[PDB]
Amino acid sequence: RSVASSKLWMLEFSAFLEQQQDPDTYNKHLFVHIGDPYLAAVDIRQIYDKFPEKKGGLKDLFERGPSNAFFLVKFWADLNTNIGSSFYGVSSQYESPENMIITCSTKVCSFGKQVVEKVETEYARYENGHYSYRIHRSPLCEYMINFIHKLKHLPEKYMMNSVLENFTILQVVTNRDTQETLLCIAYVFEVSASEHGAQHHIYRLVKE
């Protein structure tokens, strides 16, 4: 239970490209994937400038708490793709002790400024003495698809990382009715250089 507050745990997160080879054949490329460990602490003040400010922004969200809902994920994304049409998707899975109606908000930012927001509402399914929430094959917005295409058409990986220096994603999962922050995940990116593929580090966001 890494990316977990007291009320919600994200067990799975992945962004992928699915390509149809023929009517019965599909190829899936994972860009990034997450699937009692000790998570290192990062001072949240070090990342405030990289995320939206003002009311409802990262600082406001963190100050309202709870503090145990706040995480920073560093991805090394696998951009080694290939080439029937294709599908860019995001999937994620959550578990809660509580039966809630949850809202998942994803903001894509450049220089800390919101470029696009995707919003999804999810209802609970009972499973083995708890409740599960699944966002399955959510279509990646056109901005992200364009962003990825533009990244790959850069001559060198150092250029890719230079662009990514100012690209962030903020994920906020909320109880729709109470507006309690269940999970808040800040995402930062580099390109994976390793032949071993996509990698990640997960951190707890702390005040001081």
């Binding site: 290192a40 990062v42 001072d43 070090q46 400038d49 560093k74 090394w76 450049s110 220089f111 400024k113 919101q114 470029v115 901005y143 364009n146 962003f147 533009k150 850069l154 250029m159 230079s162 662009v163 220096e165 100012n166 930062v188 994976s192 390793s194 990698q199 580090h201 951190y203």
Partner: protein
């Protein structure tokens, strides 16, 4: 100008002489764990 301009963002890196984007402190220079820059 627009900070969210996608073309300008990529132009800044492709053609640095014409770069017109906000200037920031690179992650490398911030008070962060070493693991932040060293993958597992």
């Amino acid at each position: 100008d627009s900070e969210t301009d996608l073309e300008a963002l990529f132009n800044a890196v492709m053609n640095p002489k014409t770069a017109n984007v906000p200037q920031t402190v690179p992650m490398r220079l911030r008070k962060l764990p070493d693991s932040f820059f060293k993958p597992p």
